[PDB]
Symmetry: T
Amino acid sequence: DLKKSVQALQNTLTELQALQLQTKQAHWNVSGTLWYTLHELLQDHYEGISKFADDVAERQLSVGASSDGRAITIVAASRLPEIPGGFLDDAQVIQFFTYQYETVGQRIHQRVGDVEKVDPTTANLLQEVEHIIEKYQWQMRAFLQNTPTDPNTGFDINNGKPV
Amino acid sequence: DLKKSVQALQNTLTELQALQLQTKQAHWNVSGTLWYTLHELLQDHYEGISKFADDVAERQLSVGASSDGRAITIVAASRLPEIPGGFLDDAQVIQFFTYQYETVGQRIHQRVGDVEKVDPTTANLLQEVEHIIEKYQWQMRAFLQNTPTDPNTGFDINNGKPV
Amino acid sequence: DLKKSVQALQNTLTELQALQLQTKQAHWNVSGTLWYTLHELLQDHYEGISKFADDVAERQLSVGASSDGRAITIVAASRLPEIPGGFLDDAQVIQFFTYQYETVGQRIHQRVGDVEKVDPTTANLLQEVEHIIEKYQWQMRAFLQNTPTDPNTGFDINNGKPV
Amino acid sequence: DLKKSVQALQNTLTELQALQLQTKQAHWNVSGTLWYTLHELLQDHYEGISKFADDVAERQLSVGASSDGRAITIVAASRLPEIPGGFLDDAQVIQFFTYQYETVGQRIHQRVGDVEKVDPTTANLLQEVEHIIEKYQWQMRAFLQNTPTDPNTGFDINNGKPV
Amino acid sequence: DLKKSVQALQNTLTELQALQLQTKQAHWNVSGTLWYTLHELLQDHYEGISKFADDVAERQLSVGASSDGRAITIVAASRLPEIPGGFLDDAQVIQFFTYQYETVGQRIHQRVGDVEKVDPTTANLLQEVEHIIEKYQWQMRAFLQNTPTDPNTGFDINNGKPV
Amino acid sequence: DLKKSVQALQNTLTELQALQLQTKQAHWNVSGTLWYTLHELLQDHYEGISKFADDVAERQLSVGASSDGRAITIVAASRLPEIPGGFLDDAQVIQFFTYQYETVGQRIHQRVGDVEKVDPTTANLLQEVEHIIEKYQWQMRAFLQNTPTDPNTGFDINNGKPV
Amino acid sequence: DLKKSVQALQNTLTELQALQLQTKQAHWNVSGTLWYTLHELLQDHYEGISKFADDVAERQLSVGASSDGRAITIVAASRLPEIPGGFLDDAQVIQFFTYQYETVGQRIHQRVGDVEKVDPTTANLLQEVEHIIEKYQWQMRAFLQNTPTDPNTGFDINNGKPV
Amino acid sequence: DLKKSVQALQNTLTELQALQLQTKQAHWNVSGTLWYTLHELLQDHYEGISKFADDVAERQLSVGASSDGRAITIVAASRLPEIPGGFLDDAQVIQFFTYQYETVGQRIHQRVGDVEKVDPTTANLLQEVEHIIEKYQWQMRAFLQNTPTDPNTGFDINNGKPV
Amino acid sequence: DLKKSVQALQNTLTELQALQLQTKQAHWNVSGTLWYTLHELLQDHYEGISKFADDVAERQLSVGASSDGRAITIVAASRLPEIPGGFLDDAQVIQFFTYQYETVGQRIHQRVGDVEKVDPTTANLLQEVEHIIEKYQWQMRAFLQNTPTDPNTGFDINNGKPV
Amino acid sequence: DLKKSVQALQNTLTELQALQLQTKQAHWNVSGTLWYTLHELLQDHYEGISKFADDVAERQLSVGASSDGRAITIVAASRLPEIPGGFLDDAQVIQFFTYQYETVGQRIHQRVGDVEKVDPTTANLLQEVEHIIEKYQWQMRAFLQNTPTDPNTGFDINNGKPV
Amino acid sequence: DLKKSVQALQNTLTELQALQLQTKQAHWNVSGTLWYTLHELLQDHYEGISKFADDVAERQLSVGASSDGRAITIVAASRLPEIPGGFLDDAQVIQFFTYQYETVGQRIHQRVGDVEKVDPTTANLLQEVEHIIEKYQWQMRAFLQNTPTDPNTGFDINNGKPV
Amino acid sequence: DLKKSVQALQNTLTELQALQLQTKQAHWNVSGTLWYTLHELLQDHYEGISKFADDVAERQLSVGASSDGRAITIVAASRLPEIPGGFLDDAQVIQFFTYQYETVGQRIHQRVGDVEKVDPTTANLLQEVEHIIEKYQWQMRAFLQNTPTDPNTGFDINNGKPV
Ligand SMILES: [Ca+2]
Ligand SMILES: [Ca+2]
Ligand SMILES: [Ca+2]
Ligand SMILES: [Ca+2]
Ligand SMILES: [Ca+2]
Ligand SMILES: [Ca+2]
Ligand SMILES: [Ca+2]
Ligand SMILES: [Ca+2]
Ligand SMILES: [Ca+2]
Ligand SMILES: [Ca+2]
Ligand SMILES: [Ca+2]
Ligand SMILES: [Ca+2]
Ligand SMILES: [Ca+2]
Ligand SMILES: [Ca+2]
Ligand SMILES: [Ca+2]
Ligand SMILES: [Ca+2]
Ligand SMILES: [Ca+2]
Ligand SMILES: [Ca+2]
Ligand SMILES: [Ca+2]
Ligand SMILES: [Ca+2]
Ligand SMILES: [Fe+3]
Ligand SMILES: [Fe+3]
Ligand SMILES: [Fe+3]
Ligand SMILES: [Fe+3]
Ligand SMILES: [Fe+3]
Ligand SMILES: [Fe+3]
Ligand SMILES: [Fe+3]
Ligand SMILES: [Fe+3]
Ligand SMILES: [Fe+3]
Ligand SMILES: [Fe+3]
Ligand SMILES: [Fe+3]
Ligand SMILES: [Fe+3]
C-alpha cells in the first residue's frame, strides 16, 4: 500500500513544517525572563525539526511519490492551532509547545502502527521523528514540572499568576 | 520613521520565507536531466535564503518591532506565484526561479532607497539580500544564457521544445 | 534462529559489495553529458554503501557468525547482473542502477520480515540499508521522472532516442 | 575630510572599549536567577564588541591616522556612565545595558550620516557596528518586553519589585 | 502502559551505568600483555555505553517519568556481578566482559519484545543499545575465538593455562 | 610515603565519581524555571568532573597503586549526602551543589597540604581539582548571591519562599 | 645545467598561469545546460592548477633562479590560444580545455625527459603537474567520450549539432 | 544604467587581477632582511585580493553582464605600472605596493560615488574592496611610518640609503 | 606505448582491489590475542589501499583507457591466492599478508621499470603504490621479526607452535 | 585569609588588563622595520594575557569575592607607566614591553609566596601567569640580546642609534 | 639563584631529548607480538616528551639563560644508558623504558625540591614533566604487572622465558 | 642491492636528525632583529625535516633493514659542523643554515642517482627530501639575496658589517 505510507509521511511533513515556522517565530519574538533561554532552545528544536523534515520528504520520494511542502499546504492541511503574532511571552511559548509537541507526538505514534506492517522502514523513520518530538515535549514540560519541594506553577514568569 | 523600516523588513522576510519553501520544494521534486544539478544548487540557495531570513527578522527585533514569519502570513502577504505541486521538471524549475529571483530582487532594490535616508543600517542589510538574490537569479539564468556559438534554447531539457 | 539472521545478513552484504564495485566502476568510466554529475553522485552512493557494508558484516560477527566478503563470494552468490565493461554511457548508468537499486531494495524489504520476529535488532539494521538503497533508487530514477510539462524520455542523453 | 572620519572612528572605538570592559565586568560579577544566562550572553556580546573594536581601530590606521585605545582615553573620553562595582544583580545588568546599548547605537547612527558623503567605506563599517549594538540592545530589552499576556515587569528578578 | 516502558528503560539504564563504571575500572587497572590494547578498547566501549546511557535516561524523561541513575540504585538494582578490585589481568578482563556483555544483551533483547507493541519508539532505542552491547560482546569474544588453525585458548595471556 | 598519596588520590576520586553521578542525575531530572539553564550547566560540570576523575585515577596508577572506582566503593566510601530521587526542583539542585561543591573543595584543600611535601606533583593535580570544584561552587552560589539592589532570596524559583 | 631546469620550470609556470586565468574566466561566464556543472568543475581545476603554479615557482627559487609570473609574461610567452571573451557556451568550454589540457600535458611530458638526468627532483615535480593536467584533460574529454550504446556527439549541448 | 556599474565593476576586477599577479610575483622573488615577513604578508594580501576578485566578477554576472578576466585584458586595460622582474628587494616591494594600493584605493573610492545612486548593492561591494585595499596600503605604509622617536627612513633595508 | 601503461596500471588495480577485499575480510574475522591489533591495522591498510586503487584507475582514464574494476575481473585476473573463509587466526592473517604484500610489491617493482621510459608520470604513481605496499609488508613482517634477545617465533599466537 | 588572596588576584588582574590595552595599542600603531613582526607577536601576547585575565577574575569569584576589572580601576590602581599615544616605533615598543613584562613578572613572583601557604591553588594560577609573562619578556628581550658575533644594539631599528 | 634553575632545567631537557630519540628509535625498530602496540604507544610518548622538551627550553630562555639541546650535549651530559641498535624485541623495549622512565622521574622529583623555594614557576613545570614521565612509566610497567590471577611474567613475549 | 639503499637512506636520516636538533637549537636561542622571524621559520623547517625523518626511517624498515637514529649515531656519523652553543645571532643563523641546507641537498642529490636504478621508490623519497631541503636553503638564502636596487649585504643585522 503506497497510499498508506504517503498519508503517514505527508501528514508528518506538514506538521514538521508547521512546527518549523512556529519554533522560529517564537525564537525571534519570545519575551520575558526566559526569553534568551527559550531563544536558544527553540533554535535547537528548529534544527532538529528541519533535519527530520528533510528526511520525511526524502522518504516520500524514495517510495516513489511526490512531496508537498508548499506554504499553502501548511495552511491548508493545518489541523493544529497557529502561534499568535506579535511579541510572545515566555510562559505563553512554554505552554504552546508543551501541547503542540504532545499533539504531534501522539499523531506520529498512531501513524507508526498504521504503516509498520506494509512499510517498516518508513515506520522506523516515523519512530525517530516521534522520539525527537516527545523529547522536545519534555524540554518544554520540564519548565512547569511539579517537584516534592516546589509545584513549579510558573507564577514567576506569568505576572504572579499560575500558568 | 520606524513604520517605513518595518514595511521594508517585513515584506522582504515574507518573500524570503516564500522562496525558502519554494526552493526546498523544487529541491525534493525536481526531475529530468538536470534534477541532481538543481537538487544541489537549490539546497545552497535555500541555505543562503534561510540565513538572510534570520538576519531580516533579527533586524526587525533590533529596531524594536515584532517579526511575523507565520505560515498564514506567507500565504496572506503573498504577491508572488506559488510553485506547482507534484513532480517538477528541471526546465520548469529553471524558468520559475529565473523570474522569481528577478522579481524579488527588483522589489528589494526599491526598498533600499525607501529606507536609505532614515535607516542606512537596515538598507545595508537589504543590499546584502539583493546581492544574494540577484546572484541566485544569475545562477538560474545561466542555464539558458545565449552565447555566440549556441543560443541555449533549452530544447534538450524540455522534450525538444525551446524553453 | 541464528541461521535465519545469517542468511539475511550475508545475502545483504554480498549485494552491497556488488553495488560497491559497480558504483565505483561506473564512477570511473561514465561518459556523456551527465558523466561528471554521475561521477560525483556515484561516489556518494559508494560511501553510503560501503558504510552499511561494514555495519552488516559487523552485525554478522556480533550475532556470533563469520562474515564472507571475499571476491569469489561476490561472483558466486551473484544473483544480480554484472555492470558492462569499457566506457559506460550516462544514460546506460542511470538505467542500470535504477533497476539494480530497486531489485536490491525489494530483496532487503523481504529479509526484514524474515528476521523481524527472531532478531529485531538485525531487522532494524536491514531497514536502514533498505532506506539508503531506496533513496539511491530515487536519485537514479529522478533523471527520467515524468512531469506534467515534460515526460523526460532522456533523448538528450541517449543520442536522440528515448531511454 | 580626514578629521571627520577620525572623529567618528575614534569616538566609536572608545565606546566599544568601554562596553568591552563593562560587558566583561558584568560577565564575572552578575548574580541572581539570570546570572548564568547573562554570563553566557555577555560573553557573546564581548566577543562581538571586541571584534568590531579591532575593525574600527584598523580602519583608523587604514585612513592614515593613529588609534588611541589606551586605558586613560577610555576614562577621559567617557561620556557614558560607569558600571557599578561589586556583585551585580541580573535585573541591574539588564537595565544597565538596555540603556547603554541604546545610547551607543544612537550616537553611531548620527556618525554614519556625518561621514557618509566623505567616507562611505567608513560609514559602511559604522553601520555594521550600529547593527550589532542595536541587536545587543534588543537582546537586553527582550527580558522586560511587554506582551499581551504578560507585561514582564521583572518582579521575579528584582525582589518582587518592578524593574 | 507507561509502567512497562519505564521498567525496560530504567533496568537498561542501571545496567549501562554498571558497565560504565566497570569498563572504566578495567580501563585503568588492566595488566598483562594486552593491557594497552584493552585500555584503548575499554575506553571506546565506555564512550559508546555512556552515550546510550544518556539516550536511555533522556527517553525516560521523554515518556514522562523520572530517571534514577544514582549510585545507590546501581548497587541496589544490581543483578550483575561486580568487577574485582585491584590490578586486573587482561585475560580476566576479557572473560569478565565476554559474559557481562552477553548477559546484558540477552536481557535487552527480551525488553524489546516487552515494549514493542506499546512503545515502538522506545523499543527502537533498546534495539540500538542491544546492537552496541552485542558488538562489544564480539569484540571481547574474538580474543578467544577458535579458528581452524588455532583454538586460541588464551594460554599466552594466562600464565600458560587455558582461559 | 606512597600510602599518603593513595589516600588523598583515592578519596578525591570517589568524591568526583559521586559528583559525576549526581550532576548527571540532576542534569536529567531538574525542573522549574531554571531547569534548562541548570541542564546545560550541569552537563559542563559533569564533563569537567569526569575529566579530572580520569586524571586522578591515572595519577593513582602512575605512583604505582591500583584505582578503585567501582560502584560499591562510591556507596561505601560515601561521606557525602545522596542526591534525592524523582523530579528535582531547580532551587533544590542549586542548594544541593552549593554545599556539595564547597564540602568537596574544602576536603581537597586539606589533602593538598597532606601530600605537598612528599608528592608535589600529586598535590599539583589536587590543586587543579580544587580549582574546578571551587569554580563550580561559585557557579551554583551566584544564583542566590546577594547584591546591593537585590538580596536574591530565590523566592521566584521556590514557590514564593526564600531558598 | 641550471638553464635547462629554469626553461622547463618557467615554461610550465606560464602555461599554468594561463590556464589559471582561463579556467576562472570560463568559471564565471560559462552558459548552457552544463554551466553549473562546469562552474564547479572549473573551480576545482583552478585550485589544483594554482597550487602547482605555486610549487613550480617555488622550485624555481629553490634551484636559485628568479620566477617570472607577471601578466606581461603570460601574454608574451603565450604559445597557447586565448579563451574567447563574453558569454561562453558549455560545449565551447568543454572543447577548449579538452585541447588545451592535452597540449599542455604533452609539453610537460617532453620537459620531464629534458631535465630527468640533470634535475630528477624538478622532473618529479613536472611529473606531478603532468598528472593533474592529464587528469583534467580526461575530465573534459569524458563529456564527449564515445560509448557502445551512445557516441556522445554533444548535440544536446550544442543546439542540435555535433560538437 | 547597466553600463555604469559594468564600468566600475570591470575596471576594479582588472586592477584586482593585476595586484593578484603582482603580490604573488613579489611573494616569490622578494629578498633582503624583510623577505620572509613580506613573503607571508603578500600571501595574505593575495588571498584577500583573490576573494574580492571573485566577488567582483560574480557581481558582474549578477547584474547581467559578462566578466572579462583574461590575461590580455589585464595587460590591455592596464593603467598601472608593472612590477619589475627578477629578484626584488624588500624596500622596493614595500614602496611599490604603498603607491599601488593607494592608487587603486583612490580609484575605487571614485567608482563608489559613480554607482551609489543607480546600484547601491554594487557600491556596497566596491566599498568592501576599498576597505581591504586601503588596509593593505596601511600594512605596507607602516614599514616606513614616521614616529616621534624614529623617522623610519628605511636605511637598514636599503643599503644605508633612505627609501 | 599506451598498451604498456594500461597493462601495468590495470594489473596493479586488480591486485589492489584483491587486497582491498582481503584486508577487509581479515579485518572482520580475525581472531586470537592480536585480533584487535590487526583489526585496527588492517583497516588502516584498507584505507591506504583503497586510496591508491582510486588513483590507479584515475590514471587509467587520464591516459585515455577504460578501467576494469569489476568483481569478475578480480576473480579472473587473480594470480594471487584467496584468503580463507570463516574465522581467521591472528597468526594466519600475519603470515598471509606478509607474503601477499611482498608478492604484490615485487610485481609493482617490475612494472615501474617497464613504463619508466614511456610513461614516467605513471611510473611515479606505481612507485608510490610500491612504497605503501612494502610499508604494509614491514608492518606485517615485524610481528615475527627476529631480534638478538628473541627470535619471535610466534609460538604465543599459534597454540605453542612456531609460525 | 581571604583578603590576602584577593589582594594578589585583584592586583594581578589589573596589571593584566593594563597589558591587555597596551599590547593591543602597540599592535595597531607600531611602525618601522619590525612593525608587522611585532603586530603579529603583540596579538599573540594579547590573546595569552586576555585568557589569563579571565582565569584570574574567575578565581576571584571562585574564592568568594567580587572582581573589579572596570576602566577606572585600571587607571586608578595603575602603578605602571602608560604606553605613549600616536604612532609607536618598533624599537620603542620592544623596549617598553621588555621592562613592562619584567616588572609585572617580578610582582607576580612575590605574590606567589604571599599566598602559597594559605591558597596553594591560587598560587598555582599565579605561577602560570608568571610563566606566560616571563615568556613574553624573553620574546621582547631577544630582539636586543647580545651574542658572541653581534651585540645587537638595535641601531638598524632606531635611526642608527643604539637602543 | 639563576644557576640552580638552569641546572634543573638543562638537566631535564637533555634527559627529555635522550628519551625523544630513544622512544622514536624503538618506535621504528620494535619487533614481536607487541610491536605494533608499542609502535603506537611510543609515538604518543614521543609527542608528549617533545612537547615538554619545548616547554623546558622555553622556560630556560624565559629565566634569561641559553638552552643547550645540541646532539653533542645529549651524548655528553648522558648519565643514562643508550638504547641498543638493530631490531629491538618488544619485551626488551618494555623493560628498557620501564627503568628509563622511572630513573628520569626520580631525578625530576629531586629537582622540584631543589628549585621550589627560589623558582616555584619552574618547579611547577618540572612537576608537570614528572607527571607525564611517571605516567609513561606506568604504561610500560603495566605490561608485566602482577595480578591475583596471573603474575604476568612476560613469557609469551620473551621466547618462553620470564622477562 | 639492499646495502646501497640502506647507505643512502641511513646517511640521509642522520643528516635530517642533525638538522632536526640544529633548527630547534637555533629556534630557541636566536637573537637580534630577525630573531622572531627565524624563530617561526625554523619551527616550520623543523616540522618538515621531522616528517621526512620519519619517512626515511620508515622506508628503511620497508626495505627490510634496521634504522639507526640514536644520539650517538648523530654525533658519530656527523660529517657536518655542529651549531654553536649559547645565544645565536640572527645573521649567524642565516649563514649557518644557508650552507648546511646546501651541503645536505647536494649529498642527497648524489644519493638519488646512486639508487635510482636499483630502488626507484627510495630514490623517489630522496627526491622529495632534496626538494624540501633545497626549498629551505632558498628561504635562508633570500635574506641576503642581491637585487638590482640593493645588494643586501646584511649590514643591518650584523652590527654594521657585511655578512
Ligand atoms: Ca524498528
Ligand atoms: Ca534507527
Ligand atoms: Ca513572562
Ligand atoms: Ca552602504
Ligand atoms: Ca556590508
Ligand atoms: Ca526536462
Ligand atoms: Ca549519453
Ligand atoms: Ca535579582
Ligand atoms: Ca595475563
Ligand atoms: Ca522551582
Ligand atoms: Ca550549449
Ligand atoms: Ca634590502
Ligand atoms: Ca592465534
Ligand atoms: Ca624604528
Ligand atoms: Ca605548584
Ligand atoms: Ca599546572
Ligand atoms: Ca618478543
Ligand atoms: Ca621519479
Ligand atoms: Ca611523488
Ligand atoms: Ca644581529
Ligand atoms: Fe535534501
Ligand atoms: Fe536567530
Ligand atoms: Fe569495521
Ligand atoms: Fe588587529
Ligand atoms: Fe543529556
Ligand atoms: Fe584514561
Ligand atoms: Fe608560496
Ligand atoms: Fe566563483
Ligand atoms: Fe574517484
Ligand atoms: Fe569567563
Ligand atoms: Fe618553541
Ligand atoms: Fe612513524
